[PDB]
Amino acid sequence: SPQPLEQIKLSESQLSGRVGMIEMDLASGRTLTAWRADERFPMMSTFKVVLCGAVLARVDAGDEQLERKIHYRQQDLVDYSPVSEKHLADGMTVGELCAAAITMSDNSAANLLLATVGGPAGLTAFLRQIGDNVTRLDRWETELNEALPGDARDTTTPASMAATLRKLLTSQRLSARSQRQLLQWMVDDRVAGPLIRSVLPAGWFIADKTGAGERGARGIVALLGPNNKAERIVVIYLRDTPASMAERNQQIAGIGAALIEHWQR
Numbered sequence: 001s002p003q004p005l006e007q008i009k010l011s012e013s014q015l016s017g018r019v020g021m022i023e024m025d026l027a028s029g030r031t032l033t034a035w036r037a038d039e040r041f042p043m044m045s046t047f048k049v050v051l052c053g054a055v056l057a058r059v060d061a062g063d064e065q066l067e068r069k070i071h072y073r074q075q076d077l078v079d080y081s082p083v084s085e086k087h088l089a090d091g092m093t094v095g096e097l098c099a100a101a102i103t104m105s106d107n108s109a110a111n112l113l114l115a116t117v118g119g120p121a122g123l124t125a126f127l128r129q130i131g132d133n134v135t136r137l138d139r140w141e142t143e144l145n146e147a148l149p150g151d152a153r154d155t156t157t158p159a160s161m162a163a164t165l166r167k168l169l170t171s172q173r174l175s176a177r178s179q180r181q182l183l184q185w186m187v188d189d190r191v192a193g194p195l196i197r198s199v200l201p202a203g204w205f206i207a208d209k210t211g212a213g214e215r216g217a218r219g220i221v222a223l224l225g226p227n228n229k230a231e232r233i234v235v236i237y238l239r240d241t242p243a244s245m246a247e248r249n250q251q252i253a254g255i256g257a258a259l260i261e262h263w264q265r
């Protein structure tokens with residue numbers, strides 16, 4: 001594989017869309033590779049990690065409990081609710097909701113959680129509280145996936161998202177236990193985690209949250225490193241490409257391959 005930046009460029013050339021990419025050391029925040037890192041991209045379901053960061057902050061403050069059981073109605077459900085559609089009788093705990101939202105990308109779980117933090121506005125306020133002055137959520141699932149050209153709603157930048165994830169996972173804004181919980185939810189991703197592991201060389205750690213939307217929008221926020229360590233945050237977003245889902249996935253993987261082959265930078 002070519003160097004990371006060369007492969008990123010190739011992926012744009014082949015997709016006819018924009019790619020946005022950060023690679024950042026988790027422990028220090030060193031930026032290693034940056035491409036369109038200050039340009040806006042739809043977050044799609046990647047927002048679910050930030051959402052559960054806000055939830056965990058409420059837990060730490062004593063305003064929320066992961067044990068608390070939430071009951072909801074069938075008319076509350078939106079498209080793609082693999083876990084939440086199964087618990088209409090009995091409800092789900094706040095922690096189960098976060099697990100469903102992160103590990104299965106359950107849309108209704110995310111919306112229920114989003115209400116508890118004050119909606120898109122409340123999550124955006126949380127982002128401002130932790131010093132992210134760029135990322136914004138405006139809409140609920142599933143409208144937030146619309147990815148209209150030129151629309152700043154429901155967007156982040158690769159740099160902002162990487163910084164935000166580092167802040168949530170390592171900065172002690174969250175309690176140790178909450179940091180540990182957020183990481184474990186990413187480790188437990190069932191949408192892409194197992195597939196990613198099956199194509200990674202032995203020894204490479206992965207934790208992730210994926211997203212997909214309209215107009216080609218696709219993305220992943222991930223922790224990756226050799227010796228079975230979460231060494232780096234890697235954020236990759238694609239937008240405005242007409243390519244198949246399969247080819248988008250291949251291109252994201254090709255960027256991954258480039259990182260793996262040229263890791264010591």
Ligand SMILES: OC[C@H]1O[C@H](O[C@H]2[C@H](O)[C@@H](O)[C@H](OCCCCCCC3CCCCC3)O[C@@H]2CO)[C@H](O)[C@@H](O)[C@@H]1O
Nearest residue numbers: 001192195196199210220249250251252253254255257
């Ligand atoms: O196996 C050996 C080969 O491994 C890589 O090839 C990669 C390629 O770079 C990537 O484009 C493709 O993607 C295949 C698609 C896999 C999709 C899984 C990852 C997705 C899942 C959903 C979220 C984003 C990531 O895999 C091949 C190997 O199989 C190297 O590029 C190549 O030089 C090397 O000789």
Ligand SMILES: OC[C@H]1O[C@H](O[C@H]2[C@H](O)[C@@H](O)[C@H](OCCCCCCC3CCCCC3)O[C@@H]2CO)[C@H](O)[C@@H](O)[C@@H]1O
Nearest residue numbers: 196199200201220222224234236252253256257260261
């Ligand atoms: O020398 C490095 C490695 O080169 C190859 O590994 C290939 C692997 O066979 C292929 O399956 C993968 O595809 C890439 C799969 C990447 C999935 C991770 C996706 C990223 C996306 C962004 C967030 C982090 C995860 O590339 C690597 C590197 O060429 C060899 O197969 C392997 O024996 C060797 O250790």
Ligand SMILES: *[B]([O])([O])[C]([C]N1[C]=C(C([O])=O)N=N1)[N]C(=O)[C]C1=[C][C]=[C]S1
Nearest residue numbers: 044045080105142145210211212213214
């Ligand atoms: B998310 O990206 O907001 C959500 C669910 N989803 C899909 C994936 C994936 O494929 O990796 N991860 N999480 N996306 C949707 O529900 C897609 C929709 C776009 C318009 C209506 S639904």
